[PDB]
Write an enzyme that holds these catalytic residues in place. Structure first.
Site, PDB file in Angstrom:
ATOM      1  N   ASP A  21       0.843  -1.184   0.000  1.00  0.00           N
ATOM      2  CA  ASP A  21       0.000   0.000   0.000  1.00  0.00           C
ATOM      3  C   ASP A  21       0.886   1.244   0.000  1.00  0.00           C
TER       4      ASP A  21
HETATM    5  O1  LIG Z   1      -1.203   4.186   0.291  1.00  0.00           O
HETATM    6  P1  LIG Z   1      -2.551   4.821   0.501  1.00  0.00           P
HETATM    7  O2  LIG Z   1      -3.528   4.250  -0.493  1.00  0.00           O
HETATM    8  O3  LIG Z   1      -2.440   6.312   0.303  1.00  0.00           O
HETATM    9  O4  LIG Z   1      -3.069   4.494   2.026  1.00  0.00           O
HETATM   10  C1  LIG Z   1      -3.193   5.546   2.939  1.00  0.00           C
HETATM   11  C2  LIG Z   1      -3.985   5.013   4.129  1.00  0.00           C
HETATM   12  C3  LIG Z   1      -3.424   3.642   4.478  1.00  0.00           C
HETATM   13  C4  LIG Z   1      -3.827   5.938   5.331  1.00  0.00           C
HETATM   14  C5  LIG Z   1      -5.457   4.854   3.749  1.00  0.00           C
HETATM   15  O5  LIG Z   1      -6.054   3.932   4.612  1.00  0.00           O
HETATM   16  C6  LIG Z   1      -6.222   6.173   3.833  1.00  0.00           C
HETATM   17  O6  LIG Z   1      -5.943   7.078   3.122  1.00  0.00           O
HETATM   18  N1  LIG Z   1      -7.307   6.315   4.782  1.00  0.00           N
HETATM   19  C7  LIG Z   1      -8.041   7.565   4.858  1.00  0.00           C
HETATM   20  C8  LIG Z   1      -7.991   8.127   6.273  1.00  0.00           C
HETATM   21  C9  LIG Z   1      -6.657   8.682   6.751  1.00  0.00           C
HETATM   22  O7  LIG Z   1      -5.961   9.262   5.994  1.00  0.00           O
HETATM   23  N2  LIG Z   1      -6.236   8.497   8.121  1.00  0.00           N
HETATM   24  C10 LIG Z   1      -4.960   9.032   8.554  1.00  0.00           C
HETATM   25  C11 LIG Z   1      -4.920   9.107  10.074  1.00  0.00           C
HETATM   26  S1  LIG Z   1      -3.749  10.377  10.628  1.00  0.00           S
HETATM   27  C12 LIG Z   1      -3.211   9.867  12.282  1.00  0.00           C
HETATM   28  O8  LIG Z   1      -3.920   9.179  12.928  1.00  0.00           O
HETATM   29  C13 LIG Z   1      -1.863  10.292  12.853  1.00  0.00           C
HETATM   30  C14 LIG Z   1      -1.393   9.318  13.929  1.00  0.00           C
HETATM   31  C15 LIG Z   1      -0.161   9.809  14.684  1.00  0.00           C
HETATM   32  C16 LIG Z   1       0.172   8.912  15.871  1.00  0.00           C
HETATM   33  C17 LIG Z   1       1.670   8.764  16.118  1.00  0.00           C
HETATM   34  C18 LIG Z   1       1.962   7.625  17.090  1.00  0.00           C
HETATM   35  C19 LIG Z   1       3.420   7.540  17.530  1.00  0.00           C
HETATM   36  C20 LIG Z   1       3.725   6.195  18.185  1.00  0.00           C
HETATM   37  C21 LIG Z   1       4.894   6.247  19.164  1.00  0.00           C
HETATM   38  C22 LIG Z   1       6.241   6.041  18.481  1.00  0.00           C
HETATM   39  C23 LIG Z   1       7.356   5.701  19.466  1.00  0.00           C
END
Ligand SMILES: *OP(=O)(O)OCC(C)(C)[C@@H](O)C(=O)NCCC(=O)NCCSC(=O)CCCCCCCCCCC
Ligand SMILES: CCCCCCCCCCCCCCCCCC(=O)OC[C@H](COP(=O)([O-])OCC(O)COP(=O)([O-])OC[C@@H](COC(=O)CCCCCCCCCCCCCCCCC)OC(=O)CCCCCCCCCCCCCCCCC)OC(=O)CCCCCCCCCCCCCCCCC
Ligand SMILES: CCCCCCCCCCCCCCCCCC(=O)OC[C@H](COP(=O)([O-])OCC(O)COP(=O)([O-])OC[C@@H](COC(=O)CCCCCCCCCCCCCCCCC)OC(=O)CCCCCCCCCCCCCCCCC)OC(=O)CCCCCCCCCCCCCCCCC
Ligand SMILES: CCCCCCCCCCCCCCCCCC(=O)OC[C@H](COP(=O)([O-])OCC(O)COP(=O)([O-])OC[C@@H](COC(=O)CCCCCCCCCCCCCCCCC)OC(=O)CCCCCCCCCCCCCCCCC)OC(=O)CCCCCCCCCCCCCCCCC
Ligand SMILES: CCCCCCCCCCCCCCCCCC(=O)OC[C@H](COP(=O)([O-])OCC(O)COP(=O)([O-])OC[C@@H](COC(=O)CCCCCCCCCCCCCCCCC)OC(=O)CCCCCCCCCCCCCCCCC)OC(=O)CCCCCCCCCCCCCCCCC
Ligand SMILES: CCCCCCCCCCCCCCCCC[C@@H](O)O[C@H](CO[C@H](O)CCCCCCCCCCCCCCC)COP(=O)(O)OCC[N+](C)(C)C
Ligand SMILES: CCCCCCCCCCCCCCCCC[C@@H](O)O[C@H](CO[C@H](O)CCCCCCCCCCCCCCC)COP(=O)(O)OCC[N+](C)(C)C
Ligand SMILES: CCCCCCCC/C=C\CCCCCCCC(=O)OC[C@H](COP(=O)(O)OCCN)OC(=O)CCCCCCC/C=C\CCCCCCCC
Lengths: 175, 98, 140, 49, 54, 121, 88, 115, 347
Positions: G43
């Site tokens: 992906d």
């Molecule tokens: O390759 P693509 O087709 O572009 O796939 C993209 C994706 C897999 C995301 C696809 O499912 C998609 O586009 N979904 C649409 C919704 C979306 O974009 N959701 C994104 C969520 S943003 C988010 O949640 C940020 C999280 C940050 C958390 C950080 C955690 C750190 C952990 C600790 C590290 C030590």
């Protein structure tokens, strides 16, 4: 061959020089230079130059304090190096120690010339003077003669100091 | 020549070798210069004390004075080097290669 | 030091070619060692092993040149029964020059080196005979 | 002409000219007098005249 | 018909860092016209300190 | 070296008293004329550098140039003559006081000396 | 001198090396024209990771746009060649 | 001789105090106890990072003035010379030059810290 | 930097040199060297830029190491003979240390590395000062102790200096580095005759200083620091380029120009001793210096290089400040050989 105190002091002098010559971060370099300064103060105290030893110790203590400040400001790194934390520093330190020991052995065992001329040793007490004279001290009177005999020296030295202040201001001005 | 004289001359030679070899820091080279000053002071003092040269006793003192001047000069220069590069590494002083 | 030159010169010109070759290769090794020291000081080799490789290469080349020169010159002087003549020196120098060409694997260097070294060797022999001084002592 | 005033004045700088000529004449007179003095002194020393 | 005088191609061989360009010194650059090298954008590393809560 | 230490020498005199016992160089000495020529050339170069009419820009400053060069050259010539006279005096005195080092050899005529003949052919 | 005159073969070799070092790609199924989505089954986030591996291998920033459209090793090689003006 | 004994005694007493301090009590050191001290939290960087100094010029001037002090120290002995006039003149000359250097550093804004 | 402070610093440099020249005590000569270096460091840094800071740092480090060796030699001489006076220097080890320290201060090979870089890193005024006035004190000290000069060591360093200056100048495009290498070669020529006759050393020094002053003032008049920027001068100051060409020919040592007089005399002096091979080698090596002088002359005066359009504006403006003594220095640098015997007024 008499308590070896002067010889021991001179050996520690050389050891401190080797310590700060390996260049193991300027903090430890300043520590080594302070040790050498105190030890040299003792060396020249043992010959009757008490004022000169105390003066050089004072001057180098102030200088090494300033150098410590400068090392903290602009000569530091994430992991400052010590004599055993790096192969080059340790190699230079050990080479200096071994070469000093080899020199001392070559001098004590045989009266053989190393660089300048063949030495004797025999304890540096032999070359003293048997001087029984004075209600003053020769070193102090000689140093105090700087204001009656050394007018020219005082003039040039004061001019150089004033010029040095001007020069450091001009150099660090920037722009 | 007594053995203490030999030790002082060896200290001077060690300091000179330490200065002529540069590792990274300019402060370490300035320290080696100050060590050369210290060894010269001790040598002069011992020679002047052994042979009772009375008027020569101010000579080491004057020596020390100019020692400081050199030190001051070097320190000033070091500041400027740092202000140009953020470190006192001698490897940065290579502009005049070309 | 200069004591190597003494050990070389104290041997007569057309006698003991082995000892003369040994003295010549000692002088060559000393010169190559000095050249290697200066080359390492001014052009670092980026590693210790490459530095010792460069030092060994230079020292071996210089020692081989010196040994060939001394051996060839002594053999020529002894066989020809004509010492105190610069042809023996010229022959030794050219042979030494040839060795340099072989070490660097180049005919031009070998040919060029041989003529120049031979000329230089002959001039040194003439200076020894006549009494030319490179470093004249102040007399007037 | 010249839009600017031509710093070196269209008339000569009479002070500079006077001083330059004066030092030239002074040097020449001094040289002549000195030459006369050495001629007389040399003749006196060597018993010539 | 007229005397030969140097052109841009001729003059450009005197305009390098050194004469006789080599492999090692090919990447040298001539110094700036006024002898002022551009200031480096060194990152000023400030000290970050926790003041409190204890 | 050779003349720096000489007995009875005032350090920065440039013209000892005994130098007055020598004939002064004539005012028409060709070396003095050459010094005047050097001054004239300096004046002309000064005119050319400042972008002024070379021959006839400043006559007063050209005269000052020529007279300054002549003035310096006169004393330069006096000192040079004095130093050469000193060299000759010292050499003659040294020859006179060390006769065994400078002996007058026997005079021989070409009728007695036998020179080897080298034919050209 | 500096690094040698890098050519297309070296660029392709290093790109393929990077992909073989990736742990989500089967080395045998990987080829020059293997689509990152439809032959290897990745992906967009694995594609982002692979582009970052290219970025830290070749040592030059690759920004979004004209990098989202790098879907086979071939386009990566072509993009690197165009950026570095490598024609051989 | 006696100063050697005094220094050895003082250093040995301090070392013995450190030895008692480190070998008498019960030591229980874990990673959280020996961690670097901040008011409550973990440090962002390191304490070995450069620490800018705003009085560097005053430090160099301190070196120079310290050497002036070594010049001035023999004055009690100098005051016993026969010709007091030249001695007094030279001492006053030295102190006046020191004062002039201090004034020059002051007026040229040298005594102010970097902002 | 304030004009009063600049005047004070220049006066301190000159007073340090004079103190070295007029002193009979080793400590006072050392103090003169120290004062000279201390006042000289800021003058190299008058126009602030990283290159000037680099040059000042390198110069300071070299001169400080030389000062350490100087003082160590003095102290060893004192140890082996309780004499402070500058004289025969009774100890040979101290003599070698002193010779090496003074050679490092002058820039003789193999201690030459700092001269081209320091010269290139500073302005033309600081370069003029460095390459003319800074050579007086070490040469004065060397002249005073020439009786104990080891001829082998000094002559080796002099021949090395001539060879290195000639070879290094061939590769240079910048004018300041060319001047530095010419300075190294002339220092070698100067010190080669030192063990035999110091009068020849002083004569060569004076001729060299005159030629160097002429060259530097010409390079300041035409604000050129590179070969190609000097190639433009013919389109604005043709007379300056012609004078520069004649001066360059004089520095090349061609007769009947002034630059022929020193080497000529020097050769004669070494031929009064035996010393035949060395002067021959020095002449054939000075051929290299003449070669790169002639290359500069080809670029600047004997050919017309392409120019730029903006130069037309420069045609409408004259020089605001004119350097005095430039015509006199040019004349003394070219038309002085007929007055050769006047060197008798130097001893
Ligand atoms: O390759 P693509 O087709 O572009 O796939 C993209 C994706 C897999 C995301 C696809 O499912 C998609 O586009 N979904 C649409 C919704 C979306 O974009 N959701 C994104 C969520 S943003 C988010 O949640 C940020 C999280 C940050 C958390 C950080 C955690 C750190 C952990 C600790 C590290 C030590
Ligand atoms: C009786 C005496 C005998 C003769 C003595 C006198 C003759 C000396 C000959 C030596 C020639 C000097 C230079 C050598 C060649 C150049 C260096 C090199 O790279 O060589 C590689 C070259 C081929 O290798 P390469 O990889 O293709 O070259 C690399 C690139 O070309 C490019 O390589 P690079 O860019 O890396 O260059 C190396 C580097 C490094 O530069 C050097 O190499 C410097 C070396 C010069 C030292 C001279 C040695 C002389 C010693 C005499 C005393 C001997 C004691 C005994 O160059 C520099 O960075 C700058 C050079 C110049 C800057 C200043 C250096 C000068 C230092 C001062 C000179 C000596 C000072 C002495 C004391 C002074 C104190 C007052 O040749 C060699 O393989 C080395 C051997 C050279 C032949 C030596 C001949 C010896 C013959 C002896 C026979 C005696 C017979 C018996 C007699 C009785
Ligand atoms: C009173 C007047 C006298 C005054 C002077 C007196 C002197 C004596 C007192 C000395 C007391 C020493 C105490 C502390 C000294 C401070 C040292 C220091 O600060 O280190 C900074 C300096 C910089 O280190 P760094 O920047 O922090 O680290 C980066 C890497 O180092 C570099 O980065 P990299 O890894 O990328 O670079 C590649 C690698 C490259 O490494 C190499 O390429 C070196 C390998 C060369 C092979 C050596 C020859 C092997 C065979 C020769 C056999 C002899 C004859 C046998 C028969 C014939 C054989 C065929 O490293 C190098 O570049 C190192 C090159 C420099 C080597 C050492 C320089 C010493 C002089 C030059 C010697 C040249 C040797 C050639 C042959 C000479 C004639 C034998 O450290 C070094 O240079 C490394 C070694 C230092 C440890 C040894 C220090 C002892 C040397 C003292 C003087 C030499 C002997 C004196 C004895 C006199 C008799 C009594
Ligand atoms: C002033 C007026 C005018 C005068 C100025 C003009 C005249 C003077 C200048 C012109 C001549 C000087 C040239 C110098 C040598 C040039 C070589 C060179 O530059 O290297 C770069 C150049 C290219 O560099 P490279 O990449 O390394 O080589 C690739 C090759 O292409 C690939 O080559 P390859 O793979 O195909 O084969 C290589 C190999 C295989 O060799 C060959 O390929 C062909 C064979 C060539 C040499 C073998 C000799 C065969 C023919 C001679 C037979 C007797 C002739 C008559 C003599 C007796 C008279 C009755 O070569 C060798 O191994 C030859 C070893 C040398 C043995 C020859 C020894 C002869 C000594 C002289 C004895 C007579 C002196 C006269 C006395 C008269 C008394 C009345 O090297 C060559 O290609 C030529 C190498 C062959 C050497 C020829 C030398 C023989 C000529 C006589 C020289 C004597 C004149 C100077 C005296 C002092 C010299 C020590
Ligand atoms: C040994 C025996 C004696 C010989 C001694 C040596 C030679 C004589 C002394 C040399 C120095 C003297 C003057 C030097 C400064 C002059 C510079 C100059 O440009 O002059 C322009 C000037 C004409 O220009 P202007 O009238 O102002 O208006 C036109 C614009 O200025 C137009 O200006 P512009 O901007 O258009 O000019 C551009 C031009 C301007 O470029 C030049 O003019 C070249 C400047 C010469 C360089 C001088 C350097 C120092 C002298 C060294 C000489 C070395 C001699 C040794 C042999 C080696 C030869 C190099 O540059 C170029 O076009 C590029 C050409 C590149 C050629 C490269 C060759 C140049 C070097 C040649 C040196 C040879 C000596 C020349 C002597 C005469 C030159 C005027 O020439 C003169 O009028 C002066 C001539 C002499 C005056 C004597 C008159 C006195 C009264 C006559 C009667 C005599 C006594 C009466 C009593 C008898 C009873 C009745
Ligand atoms: C290209 C020409 C370069 C010349 C350089 C400038 C020319 C003008 C020189 C300025 C003249 C004034 C200098 C001195 C005048 C009064 C001071 C006087 O006391 O000096 C005494 C004597 O004056 C000077 O020593 C001599 C200066 C003469 C300079 C001219 C000779 C130039 C060399 C020959 C080239 C031909 C040039 C022709 C004229 C341009 C010093 O005596 P002494 O204390 O014992 O010397 C100690 C040092 N010693 C012994 C090693 C020499
Ligand atoms: C103020 C200046 C003057 C002072 C003058 C008095 C000097 C006092 C001497 C300094 C020690 C005093 C400290 C008080 C308790 C001693 C602690 C330590 O030294 O003893 C044990 C050190 O011994 C070793 O740890 C184990 C013993 C094995 C080695 C045998 C001893 C060496 C000699 C060989 C046998 C001979 C035994 C004695 C007969 C001669 C403890 O080891 P360790 O558990 O880590 O540390 C925890 C200590 N706790 C429990 C009190 C908290
Ligand atoms: C007297 C001593 C005699 C010395 C004789 C040796 C001189 C040989 C010079 C003839 C030219 C031969 C030659 O082909 O030189 C090659 C050879 C190496 O090949 P390069 O051309 O540099 O590499 C280019 C391709 N990579 O060049 C050299 O390194 C030698 C050139 C200079 C030789 C040293 C001369 C020094 C003389 C004075 C020393 C003091």
């Amino acid at each position: 061959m008499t308590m070896y105190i002067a010889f021991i002091l001179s050996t520690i002098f050389v050891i401190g020089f080797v310590g700060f010559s390996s260049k193991p971060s300027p903090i430890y370099g300043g520590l080594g230079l302070i040790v050498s300064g105190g030890v040299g103060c003792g060396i020249v105290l043992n010959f009757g130059g008490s004022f000169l030893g105390l003066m050089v110790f004072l001057i180098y203590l102030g200088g090494m304090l300033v150098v410590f400040g400068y090392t903290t400001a602009m000569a530091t790194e994430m992991y400052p190096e010590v004599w055993v934390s790096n192969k080059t520093v340790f190699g230079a330190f050990v080479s200096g120690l071994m070469m000093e020991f080899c020199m001392v052995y070559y001098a004590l065992k045989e009266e053989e010339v190393e660089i300048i001329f063949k030495f004797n040793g025999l304890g540096d007490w032999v070359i003293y003077d048997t001087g029984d004279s004075g209600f003053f001290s020769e070193e102090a009177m000689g140093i105090a003669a700087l204001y009656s005999y050394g007018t020219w020296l005082v003039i040039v030295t004061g001019w150089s100091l004033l010029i040095g202040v001007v020069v450091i201001m001009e150099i660090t001005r920037g722009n | 020549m007594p053995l203490v004289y030999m030790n002082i001359i060896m200290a001077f030679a060690i300091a000179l070798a330490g200065l002529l070899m540069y590792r990274s820091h300019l402060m370490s080279s300035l320290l080696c210069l100050e060590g050369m000053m210290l060894s010269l002071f001790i040598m002069s003092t011992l020679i002047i004390l052994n042979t009772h040269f009375t008027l020569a006793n101010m000579m080491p003192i004057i020596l020390l004075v100019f020692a400081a001047c050199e030190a001051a000069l070097g320190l000033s220069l070091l500041v400027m080097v740092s202000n140009t590069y953020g470190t006192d590494y001698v490897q940065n002083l290579n502009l005049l290669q070309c | 030091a200069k004591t190597l030159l003494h050990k070389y010169s104290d041997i007569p010109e057309g006698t003991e070619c082995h000892r003369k070759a040994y003295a010549s290769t000692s002088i060559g090794g000393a010169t190559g060692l000095i050249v290697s020291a200066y080359s390492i000081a001014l052009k670092p080799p980026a590693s210790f092993l490459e530095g010792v490789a460069r030092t060994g290469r230079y020292t071996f080349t210089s020692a081989a040149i010196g040994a060939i020169f001394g051996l060839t010159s002594c053999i020529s002087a002894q066989v020809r029964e004509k010492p105190d003549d610069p042809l023996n020196y010229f022959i030794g120098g050219c042979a030494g020059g040839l060795t340099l060409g072989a070490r660097t694997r180049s005919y031009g260097i070998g040919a060029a080196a041989c003529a120049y070294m031979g000329l230089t060797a002959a001039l040194v022999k003439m200076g020894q005979l006549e009494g030319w001084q490179v470093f004249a002592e102040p007399k007037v | 002409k010249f839009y600017i005033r031509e710093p070196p004045h269209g008339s000569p700088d009479w002070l500079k000219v006077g001083l330059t000529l004066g030092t030239s004449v002074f040097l020449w007179i001094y040289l002549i007098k000195q030459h006369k003095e050495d001629v007389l002194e040399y003749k006196r020393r060597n018993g010539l005249e | 018909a007229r005397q030969w005088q140097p052109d841009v191609e001729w003059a450009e061989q005197f305009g390098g860092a050194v004469m006789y360009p080599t492999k090692e010194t090919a990447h040298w650059k001539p110094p700036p016209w006024n002898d002022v090298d551009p200031p480096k954008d060194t990152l000023v590393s400030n000290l970050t300190l926790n003041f409190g809560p204890q | 070296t050779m003349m720096s230490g000489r007995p009875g020498r005032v350090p920065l005199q440039f013209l000892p008293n005994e130098a007055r016992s020598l004939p002064p160089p004539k005012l028409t000495d060709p070396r003095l004329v050459y010094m005047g020529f050097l001054g004239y050339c300096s004046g002309l170069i000064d005119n050319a550098i400042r972008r002024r009419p070379v021959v006839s820009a400043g006559l007063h400053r050209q005269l000052l140039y020529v007279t300054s060069f002549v003035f310096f050259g006169y004393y330069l010539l006096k000192r040079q003559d004095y130093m050469y006279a000193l060299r000759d005096h010292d050499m003659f005195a040294y020859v006179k006081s060390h006769p065994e080092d400078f002996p007058e050899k026997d005079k021989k005529t070409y009728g007695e000396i036998l020179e080897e003949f080298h034919p050209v052919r | 001198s500096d690094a040698p005159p890098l050519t297309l073969e070296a660029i392709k070799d290093r790109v393929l090396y990077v992909l073989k070092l990736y742990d989500k790609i089967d080395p045998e199924k990987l080829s020059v024209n293997s689509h990152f989505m439809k032959d290897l089954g990745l992906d967009s986030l694995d594609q982002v990771e692979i582009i970052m591996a290219m970025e830290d291998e070749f040592g030059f920033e690759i920004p979004d746009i004209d990098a989202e459209k790098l879907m086979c090793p071939q386009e990566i090689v072509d993009y690197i060649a165009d950026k570095k003006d490598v024609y051989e | 001789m006696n100063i050697m004994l005094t220094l050895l005694t003082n250093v040995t007493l301090a070392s013995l105090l450190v030895l008692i301090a480190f070998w008498l009590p019960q030591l229980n050191a874990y990673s959280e106890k020996t961690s670097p001290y901040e008011c409550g939290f973990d440090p962002m960087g390191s304490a070995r990072l450069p620490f800018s100094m705003k009085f560097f010029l005053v430090a160099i001037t301190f070196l120079l003035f310290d050497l002036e002090i070594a010049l001035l120290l023999p004055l009690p002995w100098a005051s016993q010379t026969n010709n007091l006039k030249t001695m007094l003149t030279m001492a006053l000359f030295l102190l006046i030059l020191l004062a002039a250097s201090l004034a020059y550093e002051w007026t040229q804004k040298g005594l102010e810290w970097a902002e | 930097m304030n004009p009063i402070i600049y005047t004070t610093l220049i006066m301190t440099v000159m007073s340090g040199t004079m103190l070295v020249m007029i002193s009979s005590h080793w400590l006072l000569i050392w103090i003169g060297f120290e004062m000279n270096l201390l006042a000289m460091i800021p003058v190299l840094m008058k126009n602030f830029n990283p290159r000037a800071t680099e040059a000042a740092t390198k110069y300071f480090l070299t001169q400080a190491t030389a000062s350490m060796m100087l003082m160590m030699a003095i102290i060893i001489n004192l140890l082996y003979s309780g004499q402070w006076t500058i004289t025969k220097m009774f100890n040979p080890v101290a003599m070698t240390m002193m010779t090496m320290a003074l050679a490092m201060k002058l820039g003789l090979s193999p201690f030459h590395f700092w001269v081209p870089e320091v010269t290139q890193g500073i302005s033309l005024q600081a370069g003029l000062l460095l390459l003319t006035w800074q050579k007086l004190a070490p040469l004065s000290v060397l002249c005073q102790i020439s009786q104990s000069i080891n001829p082998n060591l000094m002559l080796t360093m002099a021949m090395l200096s001539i060879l290195i200056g000639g070879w290094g100048g061939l590769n240079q495009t910048q004018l300041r580095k060319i001047m530095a290498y010419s300075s190294i070669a002339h220092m070698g020529w100067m010190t080669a005759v030192l063990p035999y006759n110091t009068t020849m050393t002083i004569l060569n020094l004076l001729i060299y200083i005159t030629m160097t002053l002429a060259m530097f003032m010409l390079l300041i008049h035409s604000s050129a620091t590179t070969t190609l920027s000097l190639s433009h001068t013919w389109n604005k100051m043709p007379v300056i380029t012609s004078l520069m060409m004649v001066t360059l020919l004089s520095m090349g040592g061609l007769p009947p120009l002034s630059g022929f007089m020193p080497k000529w005399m020097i050769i004669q002096e070494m031929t009064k001793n035996e010393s035949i091979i060395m002067p021959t080698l020095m002449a054939m090596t000075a051929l290299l210096n003449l070669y790169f002088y002639m290359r500069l002359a080809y670029s600047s005066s004997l050919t017309m290089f392409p120019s730029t359009n903006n130069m037309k504006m420069k045609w409408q403006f004259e020089h605001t400040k004119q350097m005095k003594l430039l015509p006199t220095m040019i004349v003394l640098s070219t038309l002085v050989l007929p007055m050769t015997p006047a060197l008798s007024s130097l001893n």
